[PDB]
Design a protein around this ligand. Structure first.
Ligand SMILES: CC(=O)N[C@@H]1[C@@H](O)[C@H](O[C@@H]2O[C@H](CO[C@H]3O[C@H](CO[C@H]4O[C@H](CO)[C@@H](O)[C@H](O)[C@@H]4O)[C@@H](O)[C@H](O[C@H]4O[C@H](CO)[C@@H](O)[C@H](O)[C@@H]4O)[C@@H]3O)[C@@H](O)[C@H](O[C@H]3O[C@H](CO)[C@@H](O)[C@H](O)[C@@H]3O[C@@H]3O[C@H](CO)[C@@H](O[C@@H]4O[C@H](CO)[C@H](O)[C@H](O)[C@H]4O)[C@H](O)[C@H]3NC(C)=O)[C@@H]2O)[C@@H](CO)O[C@H]1O
Length: 432
């Protein structure tokens, strides 16, 4: 038995989110083999539109098929076999389309076809990979180019308007913070449903109700907006859900992201109390329960970011139900003063190389030397926590010099800030 499965060749993921920042996107589709193939081993790939119905049902999603005429495989879709790497691949090109309605994820389900008889394909999962395509050609001001480090920013939204993301621009106009987090919605026990729910304090709820004026301006400029989830002093927790409790909590998180048109979640396993082990939705707090929640959340919103703060028991188990953590931890950010590290088949591109506590001051600066050190290490991210306009002097001083290194353009001093819950751009510092 020579077992094959399909994955994107560049990312090595069976489910790959693709962001078009240009007219074409090129990658390979890769079939892996468990055994060395023989001279006769062969297979092809094709778009499998029928499979999308099955995929959407399995994930409770509603991705529309990406126009097939915009996808082309080299070599008629035939996979070129490399027996010395137990794999076969073909180049695939995605072209940006014409009148595709924007802010919408399209699917390219890809199937192994016409495989020789020596190849076994154990199930429909092994037979397919999927690309989830988003046209980002117009949302480019957060996009600072291919291969660069990216910013990840927490707002304490009890106090600070996330439109202050827009205060942080390079001298060339690009937005520094690729990803921002609304810190935080909570996990808490709901007695009447008998399970955990998402519980939003009035500040979080106000932002969500008013996402069109206080959040969507960011997304239109390319910023990803995540809902932060945080433990909240009861029996429920992000690292103490049973398999069934995690499946349900995961669907509630995805539903928030869909309802308020957000881009994903950050899980932070802090401030929960001991679970009630008699409850079928809870279990012993463990990094394995955290990984289960991450896996289930990614299954429920596969086009959206699943990200964790590496603290508590939120991060460290690398496999759930045979699926490696690279498929369900998009970004991991570490505690102030340290670099995140990868697990399973993740790379440092999924990892923060610095975490700055902007409100209390710990964790270093995004200096020219730290920027080069992090580039040298292969790190994908820098993280900041709780900036506020009243501390812009300290915050921006901690960003001097790094932007030249990372992007060829330093962070510009701020000239705008926003007040809580107020869409008005005020002059910084005058209007403070
Ligand atoms: C990724 C990451 O960073 N993760 C964590 C972060 O969580 C952490 O952030 C800090 O967390 C602590 C702890 O937060 C938890 O516990 C809080 C306390 O709860 C307990 O008491 C409650 C009753 O008081 C009780 O109900 C509860 O059951 C507990 O027993 C919770 O309040 C908190 O939940 C709330 O916030 C979270 C989000 O943070 C929401 O999800 C949740 O729904 C809820 O709304 C959470 O469970 C916090 O205590 C820290 O908060 C301080 O700093 C943040 C900025 O980061 C501010 O936004 C806060 O307001 C707070 O600042 C203090 O604010 C007061 C009032 O404005 C200031 O007092 C004034 O002080 C001056 C002098 O200085 C004068 O005297 C004046 O008269 C006073 O009014 C005070 O100065 C402020 N202090 C500071 C330090 O600025 C953080 O949120 C961070 C830590 O770096 O990193 C990781 O660990």
């Amino acid at each position: 038995e020579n077992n094959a499965y399909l994955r994107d060749g560049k990312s090595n993921l069976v489910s790959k989110v693709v962001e078009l920042h240009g007219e074409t996107y090129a990658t390979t589709v890769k079939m892996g083999l468990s055994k060395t193939p023989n001279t006769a081993t062969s297979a092809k790939v094709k778009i499998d539109a029928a499979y999308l119905e099955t995929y959407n049902k399995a994930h409770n999603t509603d991705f529309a098929l990406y126009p097939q005429d915009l996808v082309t495989f080299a070599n008629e879709g035939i996979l070129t076999v490399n027996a010395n790497t137990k794999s076969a691949e073909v180049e695939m090109t995605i072209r940006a389309g014409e009148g595709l309605q924007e802010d919408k994820t399209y699917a390219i389900p890809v199937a192994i076809s016409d495989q020789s008889s020596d190849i076994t394909i154990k199930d429909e999962d092994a037979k397919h990979c999927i690309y989830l395509v988003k046209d980002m050609r117009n949302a480019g001001d957060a996009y600072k180019g291919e291969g660069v480090m990216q910013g990840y920013l927490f707002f304490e939204v009890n106090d600070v308007n996330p439109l202050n993301t827009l205060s942080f621009q390079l001298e060339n106009g690009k937005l520094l913070w690729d990803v921002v987090v609304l810190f935080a919605a909570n996990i808490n026990y709901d007695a009447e449903a008998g399970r955990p729910r998402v519980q939003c304090n009035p500040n979080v709820q106000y932002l969500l109700d008013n996402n069109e004026t206080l959040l969507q301006p960011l997304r239109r400029r390319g910023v990803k907006v995540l809902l932060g989830l945080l433990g909240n002093h009861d029996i429920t927790g992000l690292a103490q859900l049973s398999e069934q409790g995690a499946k349900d909590f995961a669907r509630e998180v995805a539903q928030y992201c869909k309802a308020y048109n957000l881009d994903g979640v950050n899980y932070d396993d802090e401030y929960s109390n001991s679970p009630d082990l008699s409850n079928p939705s809870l279990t012993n707090p463990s990094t394995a329960a955290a990984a289960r929640l991450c896996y289930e959340t990614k299954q429920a919103m596969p086009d959206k970011l699943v990200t964790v703060f590496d603290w508590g028991q939120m991060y460290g188990v690398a496999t759930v139900d045979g699926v490696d953590a690279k498929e369900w931890i998009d970004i991991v950010v570490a505690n102030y003063g340290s670099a995140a590290y990868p697990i399973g088949q993740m790379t440092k591109k999924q990892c923060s190389g610095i975490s700055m506590e902007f409100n209390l001051g710990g964790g270093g600066s995004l200096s020219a030397s730290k920027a080069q050190s992090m580039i040298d290490g292969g790190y994908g991210w820098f993280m900041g926590f709780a900036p506020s306009p009243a501390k812009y002097g300290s915050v921006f001083s901690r960003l001097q010099g790094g932007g030249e290194v990372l992007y060829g353009s330093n962070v510009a001093a701020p000239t705008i800030f926003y007040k809580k819950n107020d869409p008005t751009p005020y002059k910084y510092p005058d209007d403070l």
